From a paper:
The human leucocyte antigen (HLA) molecules, encoded by the major histocompatibility complex (MHC) region of the genome, are cell surface glycoproteins responsible for the presentation of both endogenous and exogenously derived peptide antigens for immune surveillance. HLA-B*57:01, HLA-B*57:03 and HLA-B*58:01 are micropolymorphic HLA allotypes of the HLA-B17 serotype. Polymorphism within these allotypes is focussed on regions of the antigen-binding cleft (cleft polymorphisms in comparison to HLA-B*57:01: Asp114Asn and Ser116Tyr in HLA-B*57:03, and Met45Thr, Ala46Glu, Val97Arg and Val103Leu in HLA-B*58:01). Notably, residues 97, 114 and 116 contribute to the E pocket of the antigen-binding cleft, whilst residue 116 also contributes to the F pocket.
HLA-B*58:01 had the most shallow C and D pockets and B*57:03 the shallowest E and F pockets. HLA-B*58:01 was similarly able to accommodate Arg and Lys residues within the E pocket, although the manner in which the Arg at PΩ-2 interacted with Asp114 differed. That is, in HLA-B*57:01-LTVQVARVW the PΩ-2 Arg formed a bi-dentate salt-bridge interaction with Asp114, whilst in HLA-B*58:01-LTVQVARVW the PΩ-2 Arg side chain was twisted by 60° and the Asp114 side chain rotated 90° to accommodate the Val97Arg micropolymorphism. This altered the salt-bridge between the PΩ-2 Arg and Asp114 to a less favourable conformation in HLA-B*58:01, consistent with the reduced thermal stability of the complex. More subtle changes were induced by the Val97Arg polymorphism in HLA-B*58:01. In contrast, PΩ-2 Arg negatively impacted the stability of HLA-B*57:03 and HLA-B*58:01 complexes.
Residue numbers in the entry:
A (entry chain B): 1 to 99
B (entry chain C): 1 to 9
C (entry chain A): 1 to 276
Amino acid sequence: IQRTPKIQVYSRHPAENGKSNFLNCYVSGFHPSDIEVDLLKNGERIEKVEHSDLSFSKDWSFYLLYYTEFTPTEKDEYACRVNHVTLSQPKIVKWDRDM
Amino acid sequence: LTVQVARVW
Amino acid sequence: GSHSMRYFYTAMSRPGRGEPRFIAVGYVDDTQFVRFDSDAASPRTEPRAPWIEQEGPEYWDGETRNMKASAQTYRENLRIALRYYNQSEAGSHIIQRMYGCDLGPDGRLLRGHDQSAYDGKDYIALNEDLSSWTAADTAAQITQRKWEAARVAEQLRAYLEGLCVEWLRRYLENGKETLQRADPPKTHVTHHPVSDHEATLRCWALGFYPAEITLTWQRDGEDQTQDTELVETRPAGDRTFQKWAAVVVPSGEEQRYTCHVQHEGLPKPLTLRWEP
């Protein structure tokens, strides 16, 4: 009846500290469509995150891209936090430059 | 251009 | 290359929280070009690609009227489906529809599609003949009978063979610079030790369009599908897509592994290796 989201966190361009870029959280394969996605910077919710218009794949499961401009550093940490009816508690996926 | 055909279930 | 146009409708009920939300989006291949959202402050079919913007007021007004009409129809369909499945009015449910046309590389209609789902499961689909239906269950059979009686398949066929193709071709022409341009992947292999005796080879494809791609690892020329970790193709946010494929290999055997990349923007498939 219900499908849990796949979550990927990554940058639009390969990360270069000091260079502006876009942080993405792509959630996919989920059903139903209601989902809560936050982008986190050092554990704190980033404001004014934008997202794509709801659409779906050939298996009817939904996908959404959440994105925000950012400038990577060595110290700063970024994550995506997702909640969905299929999850007991929010799932946090950390951004990894090489993933 | 979308289809105008009504599809009542 | 070949091209397709697709519209995707999602109608979602939310008892206690107003009338069902209806959202429609239209795509040519992997490029979205319109949106309609009944939850917008002022629901209107809106442009989401620059090449669609030149269409005139009659286009946007027409599409807006059609979309609102569809929104209402799908609210009705959600009520109906409640009756078809013996469901209460307390739960939230979703109807989805995807339809459109596929053109071959010569611009001719390859085939048409019009398929619907209820709560994420197949409900009914127009067959490839554009004249008969496939119902997934006894509820959808009722719908099928109604549609056979109203000759819905005939009207859908006239659309898919006519307006759908003509307007797709029109869009392809207007969006020639982007819609008819494949961007080949930029590819590389990375290497990270997992331990003293194993390493991960990760084959990357970046910046490609359209999304369709094939990344495979071979060991000694033999496919490693079962031992390959493949992530889902993901959008970059600049129209392009990204994908990687990873394999864990014995230290000292890295050169026995080759990554193979197929994509529409490449004249020939690529073979790459880790370069120490």
